[PDB]
Design an enzyme around this catalytic site. Structure first.
Site, mmCIF file in Angstrom:
data_model
loop_
_atom_site.group_PDB
_atom_site.id
_atom_site.type_symbol
_atom_site.label_atom_id
_atom_site.label_comp_id
_atom_site.label_asym_id
_atom_site.label_seq_id
_atom_site.Cartn_x
_atom_site.Cartn_y
_atom_site.Cartn_z
ATOM 1 N N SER A 1 8.606 56.687 8.515
ATOM 2 C CA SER A 1 7.300 56.112 8.212
ATOM 3 C C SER A 1 6.224 56.918 8.939
ATOM 4 O O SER A 1 6.049 58.097 8.661
ATOM 5 C CB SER A 1 7.255 54.631 8.627
ATOM 6 O OG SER A 1 6.181 53.960 7.972
ATOM 7 N N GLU B 1 10.420 50.788 -1.021
ATOM 8 C CA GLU B 1 9.488 50.992 0.082
ATOM 9 C C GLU B 1 8.396 49.933 0.216
ATOM 10 O O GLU B 1 7.935 49.669 1.315
ATOM 11 C CB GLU B 1 8.829 52.368 -0.049
ATOM 12 C CG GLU B 1 9.810 53.535 -0.120
ATOM 13 C CD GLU B 1 10.407 53.906 1.231
ATOM 14 O OE1 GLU B 1 10.279 53.113 2.189
ATOM 15 O OE2 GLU B 1 11.012 54.996 1.332
ATOM 16 N N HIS C 1 12.068 49.404 3.412
ATOM 17 C CA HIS C 1 11.428 50.485 4.157
ATOM 18 C C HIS C 1 11.921 50.366 5.605
ATOM 19 O O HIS C 1 11.796 49.307 6.229
ATOM 20 C CB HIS C 1 9.908 50.288 4.081
ATOM 21 C CG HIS C 1 9.105 51.272 4.877
ATOM 22 N ND1 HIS C 1 8.948 52.589 4.502
ATOM 23 C CD2 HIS C 1 8.366 51.111 6.001
ATOM 24 C CE1 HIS C 1 8.143 53.196 5.357
ATOM 25 N NE2 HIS C 1 7.776 52.321 6.276
#
Ligand SMILES: *[C@@H]1O[C@H](CO)[C@@H](O)[C@H](O)[C@H]1NC(C)=O
Ligand SMILES: *[C@@H]1O[C@H](CO)[C@@H](O)[C@H](O)[C@H]1NC(C)=O
Ligand SMILES: *[C@@H]1O[C@H](CO)[C@@H](O)[C@H](O)[C@H]1NC(C)=O
Ligand SMILES: *[C@@H]1O[C@H](CO)[C@@H](O)[C@H](O)[C@H]1NC(C)=O
Ligand SMILES: *[C@](C)(O)CCC[N+](C)(C)C
Ligand SMILES: *[C@](C)(O)CCC[N+](C)(C)C
Ligand SMILES: C[C@H](O)CCC[N+](C)(C)C
Ligand SMILES: C[C@H](O)CCC[N+](C)(C)C
Ligand SMILES: [Cl-]
Ligand SMILES: [Cl-]
Ligand SMILES: [Cl-]
Ligand SMILES: [Cl-]
EC number: 3.1.1.7
Lengths: 532, 528
Positions: free
Chosen positions: B197, B324, B437
């Site tokens: 991320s 995600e 995610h």
């Protein structure tokens, strides 16, 4: 005498015509207007003045002056749409097929040929009305109207070339049916007007025009609607094109009187030779002289009229064919050919979209391209061909019609929608073209009923059910025969939006004909082009 | 001693730790910079001044000051990402795991935690580096960096709060590895940095920044790239948020020094309490204080740097997860819940897209809506949920990453792309969220290898091949040891799925949707 009928304008003598082992009466080439020749060119039509003696109505009339397609000399697939009679400005006549013995007060159907408003004839073999009139026992009328410049040159303000005279020619033929059809056994209170392509747009335009509304009962639209992008232009665009036609002939442009005067001195073929030069851009499915939003025949914008319900409220039966765009791609888009599979490269695809949506800005083009491109296989020649086929058909016919059906249904009294997707076994056109624009007509007029035409047994049956759907709809406003056994064609409702496929297989009911693409064409694209 | 190491700044005493019925060396909480406290708040990091005596490196350090997620108290799914120790501005430390016996000039891997630049800790259980270091025999380093205003308040022009200090902290940690890893058996010329991320975006930003290029050999980006829409802001936007932060706290706004002095007097939590109030719109997957395109750490715009090829040219290995967007929808979009299938009505779908693309005008919103709505069944709640799920993920992670991968590959020296789509069997989040995610991390760090965690045997194997792909790539530039993970090329653009089934090769990962997000929408927004 079954063949001798006296109308409000004079006597007429028909002829006995054979049909499927039987016979019917035919009244061919009856005049409904004064020859719009000489000083009458571009002018509103005038009622045919009474004549003396018996008018011989045993032969087809001349066809109106028009562009003739010579792309494929000798090829039946294209020539079946060209004038099959001598061309002349003196072409405002109509044809009638009456069952024998003469019915008392039966259903009437009036046919309005298409042809982009630049061509078309009431006398083509594919429009022979004897089969339908005979099989469904209806009085079938075939009308005509000026096309091209002769029928749609528009110079708003002038009363010499006001525009829409072609539409007015149609109205006059309908006024004639209204006043004299009772003399041929037809009920003027039960007339259905039907047409394909430009003819279909016309029918929808009469549904909208207050001056045509009371001249018919119901309407059928085949592959065409009034709101199509190619079916009309603004008074400004109409004038621009009109002036451009003059410039192409070295006409005096100082005033409408002089421009018109100059254009009336030209030979028909002189006008026709430069007809296509006045178009705004390089394009396909675009025609030079078409109806104009004049504020007269059409009170206000077509859209505002559809939103307010300003139009005849009755029953309508309409639909489209599976591959509406192929015919036009073959003629004006690169990579397309009659004698090939026409696999389109990426380069030609791009060119095609530019050509198909000529009024779009670069952003609009990217949008169209993205909406119709499989980016996991962009160089697929077949997906690119079919993609273009869908673009042209969705933009020019299907989505405009879906827009129409949805708006109309909010106020109408009955909507029946169809999707014609049958590829005739004896089609002379290449396989890639599919179910071509205009090829449901032969089924509508029963050509499959004549043995030597070599249609299959299932195609004859399909033809018979389509004719019965059309006729039954004409007579009652519902294609279905109550308490009958066969599957029922459901009503199109604003909520369920049902429609049926029209082919040789058992009936199938679907919903939301191409909503995805049409939402794109009717909602998103316009908003995008309206931005800046 | 194996646990006593002399670094250029002083001595450190590690600790012998158990791991999979064996052991390895662990050096926890080693200071790499001077505590950025007091007048050093918002200022670039300063190298840690040498110390005398032996530094106790047997236990984890403090976590940087950050917003703490209290949405689901007691719920391990959200808490596993929260600081697991005291928060403090004195948080610039790094952790090292060395295999026992100490190897010689071995491959090093540096982990950079994510957390949208507003949170994250190097001490999380899921970042425990002992499994990966032992199993693949690499020296594993996990660094830390200031997040939130502390690390990214940007007032371009000032040298007291220039912006990007968080990235600079990461750089100083890498610089420290460059100067001391050799003393732990690490090979300073073979260093791989990897993160998820915001951690992946950081890795990407270091590949771009000139001052960072020589501090590492190769890079791995997990669900994040430098060009993500949430990963950076202009100097103008950074200053606006900075000034708005002061306003929220009744600060003197006459000048930078006055503004900064005021902000430096506030307690950490006072800043954090109003952190979110500076965002310009109501939205999701958007964070207040992030990196700034300052013309210094980043010479020019990210895009122009990518087109000119102005960046480190080496081998990269990057990928994304199947879903995600679910995590962020659950926290900021109407209709979503942790205890339900979350069927999204039509109205909530509309609200969702607006929240997902806050910068878009009405035409843009219609465009995103049409692109993700099946009009033959628009009132289908599951389709609206999944659609919204793809919108958030395609726009914020997948497509920006594909844009990066295609641009990089033109100049790079080797690209390997993956698509992680395995739904963990012991996942505590609801099924509608899918492959969430951040949940490939537990696989990258070998957590499945520990019995008590109750993963399936197939998941353990998956984790082992993933750790080996990562480690092998780090030491050679190729995840394959001489089913082969094909190289991503400009032409064929191949990538592999990463799950429990036999490897499968594909091409053009979500090209259709990404053509929309990378070319059409941008063009549409620029035109209208
Ligand atoms: C009408 O025209 C047809 C065809 O030319 C002809 O056969 C017929 O004799 C004509 N009738 C009369 C008497 O004019
Ligand atoms: C058509 O109009 C009639 C008379 O008002 C009404 O009873 C009927 O329900 C309408 N049919 C449809 C399909 O709208
Ligand atoms: C380092 O700190 C830990 C925990 O505070 C302690 O257990 C350990 O004994 C310390 N190091 C030594 C051996 O002095
Ligand atoms: C990487 O660089 C080397 C040497 O410059 C070259 O031989 C090799 O082909 C490159 N690898 C790729 C796939 O770009
Ligand atoms: C429509 C635009 O009027 C086109 C009609 C063309 N034919 C070939 C079917 C007559
Ligand atoms: C990324 C925006 O840095 C978000 C990462 C979120 N966690 C929960 C995986 C840390
Ligand atoms: C539809 C159609 O054949 C268009 C007419 C052809 N040009 C423009 C070439 C004369
Ligand atoms: C996912 C995440 O914790 C978002 C932050 C929540 N608010 C906006 C309420 C502070
Ligand atoms: Cl529609
Ligand atoms: Cl353990
Ligand atoms: Cl704690
Ligand atoms: Cl390449």
């Amino acid at each position: 005498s079954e063949l001798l009928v006296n109308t409000k304008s004079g006597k007429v003598m028909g002829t006995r015509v054979p049909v499927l082992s039987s016979h019917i009466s035919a009244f061919l080439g009856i005049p409904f207007a004064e020859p719009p020749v000489g000083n009458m060119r571009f002018r509103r039509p005038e009622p045919k003045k009474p004549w003396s003696g018996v008018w011989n109505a045993s032969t087809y009339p001349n066809n109106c002056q028009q562009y003739v397609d010579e792309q494929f000399p000798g090829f039946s697939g294209s020539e079946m749409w060209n004038p099959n009679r001598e061309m002349s400005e003196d072409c405002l006549y109509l044809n009638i097929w009456v069952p024998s013995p003469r019915p008392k007060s039966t259903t009437v159907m009036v046919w309005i040929y298409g042809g982009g408003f630049y061509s078309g004839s009431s006398t083509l073999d594919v429009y022979n009305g004897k089969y339908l009139a005979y099989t469904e026992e209806v009085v079938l009328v075939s009308l005509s109207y000026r096309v091209g410049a002769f029928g749609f040159l528009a110079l708003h303000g002038s009363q010499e070339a006001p525009g829409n005279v072609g539409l007015l020619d149609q109205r006059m033929a309908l006024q004639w049916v209204h006043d004299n059809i009772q003399f041929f056994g037809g009920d003027p209170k039960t007339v259905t007007i039907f047409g394909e392509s430009a003819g279909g747009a016309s029918v929808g335009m009469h549904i909208l025009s207050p001056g045509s509304r009371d001249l018919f009962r119901r309407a059928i639209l085949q592959s065409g609607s009034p709101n199509c992008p190619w079916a009309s232009v603004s008074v400004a665009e109409g004038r621009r094109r009109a002036v451009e036609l003059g410039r192409n002939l070295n006409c005096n442009l100082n005033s409408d009187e002089e421009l018109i005067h100059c254009l009336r001195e030209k030979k028909p073929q002189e006008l026709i030779d430069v007809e296509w030069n006045v178009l705004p851009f390089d394009s396909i499915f675009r025609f030079s002289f078409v109806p104009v939003i004049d504020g007269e025949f059409f009170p206000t914008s077509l859209e505002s009229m559809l939103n307010s319900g300003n139009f005849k409220k009755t029953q309508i039966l309409l639909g489209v064919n599976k591959d509406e765009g192929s015919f036009f791609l073959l003629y004006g888009a690169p990579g397309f050919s009659k004698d090939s599979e026409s696999k389109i490269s990426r380069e030609d695809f791009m060119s095609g979209v530019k050509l198909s949506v000529p009024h779009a800005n670069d952003l609009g083009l990217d949008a169209v391209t993205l909406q119709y491109t499989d980016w996991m296989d962009d160089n697929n020649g077949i997906k690119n061909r079919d993609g273009l086929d869908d673009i042209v058909g969705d933009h020019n016919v299907i989505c405009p019609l879906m827009h129409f059906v949805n708006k109309y249904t909010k106020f109408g009294n009955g909507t029946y929608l169809y999707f014609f997707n049958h590829r005739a076994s004896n089609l002379v056109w290449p396989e890639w073209m599919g179910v071509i624009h205009g090829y449901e007509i032969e089924f509508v007029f029963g050509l499959p009923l004549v043995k030597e035409l070599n249609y299959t047994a299932e195609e004859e049956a399909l033809s018979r059910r389509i004719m019965h759907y059309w006729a039954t709809f004409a007579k009652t406003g519902n294609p279905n025969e109550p308490h009958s056994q066969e599957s029922k064609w459901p009503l199109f409702t604003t909520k369920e939006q049902k429609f049926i496929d029209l082919n040789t297989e058992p009936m199938k009911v679907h919903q939301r004909l191409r909503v995805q693409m049409c939402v794109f064409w009717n909602q998103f694209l316009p908003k995008l082009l309206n931005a800046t």
